[PDB]
Every structure is written in structure tokens, then in C-alpha cells.
Design a protein around this nucleic acid. Sequence first.
RNA 1: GGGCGGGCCCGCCC
RNA 2: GGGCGGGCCCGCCC
Lengths: 256, 256
Amino acid sequence: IDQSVVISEKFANSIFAAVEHIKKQIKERDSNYKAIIFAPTVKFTSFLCSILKNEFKKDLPILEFHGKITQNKRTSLVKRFKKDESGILVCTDVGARGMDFPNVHEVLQIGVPSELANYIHRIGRTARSGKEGSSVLFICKDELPFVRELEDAKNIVIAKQEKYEPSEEIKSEVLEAVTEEPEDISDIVISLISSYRSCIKEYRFSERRILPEIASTYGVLLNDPQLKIPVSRRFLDKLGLSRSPIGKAMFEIRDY
Amino acid sequence: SIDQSVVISEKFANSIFAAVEHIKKQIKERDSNYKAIIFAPTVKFTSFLCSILKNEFKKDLPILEFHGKITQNKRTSLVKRFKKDESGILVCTDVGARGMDFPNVHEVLQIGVPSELANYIHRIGRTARSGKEGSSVLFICKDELPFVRELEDAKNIVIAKQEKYEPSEEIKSEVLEAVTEEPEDISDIVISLISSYRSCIKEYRFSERRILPEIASTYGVLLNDPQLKIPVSRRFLDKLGLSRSPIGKAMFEIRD
RNA sequence: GGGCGGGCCCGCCC
RNA sequence: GGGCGGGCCCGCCC
């Protein structure tokens, strides 16, 4: 397994990095690309499918797959993806139940996994039964402590590292194809905020840095970097970031 | 070291009385030095059992409620507490088993069959530990019996002591009077049992035509009107998929 | 001791 | 789509 890790300045930029990477692979392989792309939350998984569809609906079949997909539909698109020699399966850390897919070229990871163990489980889906394979972990600056934890804990090193700053061209291409409304982007980012908040201690993250960055994804996606997430003073209490400067950095109070 | 027995009652509901009587006896004989685990199929039913057992033995013993929908903090504490207690009854579902090794447990009671054939073993493991003696009592009803035959054929276990049980009018009144729950709650409770039992029919070779009406009849029995059926909407009956079924007519009273 | 919310997943049934 | 049971991680209040 040829493991690599693409670091970006902002969490959001991991999205672009991934889209670009996919475009390159499709061009080189003439649309003979079959990859699994993992995501931290269900809402963010669906969000990724939209983008990937708007980008590569024509070239590849984009498959959404997570816990909140009904069992019938889950059984059918596992069978389908087993058959497909081309397509991208976007999913969360779903159970291995019957997740043995042949001829998978790459496993992509946008953002760290919920728990340290899953990193191993994810890359297992490629380079099996003799075939070659690659893994690409797209993270941001503030997620880095995860890689260190992979070594100290599970004793795994990622040989190839690389920085990434997105072109103004790619940012516009992606964001333009985003049809979701602000209320949906908020739901999406909040699910990320909660996910990342849950794995701070485990990955020795810096709360004061990581949360604001994740939240900033809201503005970045709505093409207004300095626009913060609108919430009620009550909702903020419900998150427990009410009297916190981190909260003032992440959110815009609107209780009037 | 495990003295296994099984008390068969005519109706599911009667297993409740059988258990309460059993517990009273053990308390009398042991002068309240009784420590037992009593397993239950659903959460709501577990809580319902705690109410009864509290009204019956709050003075003599500590009654502890323990299931998946108990918050992790409260779960850590009452595990510690029960480990320490030399007297008390833990009412729970097939929870855990993350460190569920409780010392000096005298009996494991089981009201109704377990969800999985395997769990029967797991449950009785909690007694007769590290040399000490222990006993198991399985309270079931006529229609659950196929479970015992399945235990032999599959798991190759035989329960030596059997006993048929028909409750006195005295005990029925003692228990039911202490029940503070309202009819809407008794409906919620029985429905959880209806669904639990419906999920383990094929596995235990139960007769749907017999077992479900019996479980549902628990509603009347508890409200002291044996022929009173469970009130539900034609919509709710469709949600369960027992709409055009005679079994549904036997279990429910339609109010569309 | 009591109350409440959030992220991910698994098993079984209709 | 719904139901029953369960696992892991996180936050808040008294």
C-alpha cells in the first residue's frame, strides 16, 4: 500500500485537493477509476456526493453509502459496486459486513477517521490479493497531530507527505457547483464540529485552533471567509460554547 | 456449579408474578441477604419491572436499573455500586459486557427468553463465579417453550428442574395494585415486548399465531381486564405491518 | 446522586 | 422507510 498524506492550510481545502486528485486520476486512467473515499459524518458524506456528482457524474458512478442508508439499498449498491470496474464509493466508517471490493485502485480519506484503529481498516480495502494500491489522507494543518499519534500508537508511518494550496480556479469550479443552501451548509459543518470535538483528546488536537478552523468551513463554502455560523444564544448553550471565546470565533449569535 | 431451573406459566404476564413471589421467598429465607441479576427483553419492560420490585422490596433491597439507554456516567457508578453491594437486585437487559463481573451473586433470574440463544449462557455465567455456588431461574410461558428444546438441540443444555406455575389471586392483586403506571404506559411497554418477541420467532421456532396474541394480552392482564385489547390507529397498525392480519385483530382494537 | 444533548457504528425483525 | 436490542467516542446542567 503506497500511503501518502496531503496537507492543506484549511480543512475546507482538503475538499478541493481531493477533487483535483480525482480529476487527475480520471484523465490518466481514461475514466477507469475505482476508489473509496471516506468521510467523518453522514451529512458531509452526502455533501461530498453532490460535489463529486456535479464534477464526475458524466465520467463515473458516484455512490453514497452510510449508516442512514436503508438496508435494502445498502445490499444492492454493495453488489453493484462489487460489479463496477469504475466508480467512486463515498462512505463513512461503515462496518466491514460485506465490504470486500475487488480492483479498487485508491482509498481516499478527507479528514481524519473517528478513531485511530479505523485508519488501518480503511486502507485495507485496497492493495489486496496481490494487486497494488494507494492511500491518500487529505488533512489540514491542525489535524497533523493525528499522524504523530499513528506512529506512537499503532506504529505506522506515512512516507510521502506534501503540501497543497488550491488555485482560485478550482475553488470557483467547485463552489459554483454547490447547490446546497446556507441552512444545509450549517447543518453539515456543525456535524463536523461535533465529530472533531469528539476526537480531540485522543489525537492531542488544540481545541482553540481546530474548532474555529472546522467552523470556518462555513464561510469558505459560502464564499465569504469572514462570515461566521448563525445560531441562537440558546443553541450555543446547547453546545456548551456559550461563554467561550472559541464560540465567539466560530459563531454569530442571533437571539433577537 | 450452576443450578438451572425453569418456571412455566400459562401466560407471559404470569412470569412477572412468578418472579416476584420467587424473590419474596428468597428474601424471607435469606433475611434480605439477597443479591441477584434479573434480565429483561426490552428497556421499557426493564423499567416497569423496577417499579414493581421497588414497590415490593424497596425497604429490603436496593433495586438497580441498568440498560443501554442509561448514560455512561450513571452506568459507571452503579456498576461500581453493585460490585460493592452484598444485597440488591440488578434489573437489566442483555447489556455490556464491559466489565460486568459482579461477585457474590446468588441468582440470575430471566423473565422471558433472551434475544439470542447464545446469551442464555452469557447470563448464567454471572453466577456461580470463582468457586461459589449459584442458581438460574428461567421464567417463561407456555408459548415460549420451543426455546428450551432449541437449547438442547443447538447448545446441548438441559434444564433439570421444571415447574408449572399458576398465580394466586392474592399475588396478582398485590402486584397490580402497586403498579402506578397508566394505560398509555402499559401500552408502550407491551408493544416493546411485541416487537422484541416478533424479532426472535424464526430463531426459536415460535408460533406467530400464538405467541404475539399472548404477549399482547399482557395489556389486559395488567389493566385487570383480560379481554381488553390494545388501542391503536389503523395507521399505526400499518406501520407494524399487521393491518390485514387476523393476528392484528386478535391483538389490537382499531381506532382509525 | 439526578437531569439533558451530540458524532459514528453493529445485530435482529417488519 | 419503520421497529427492537446493543457498542465506541464527545459535550452540558443541577
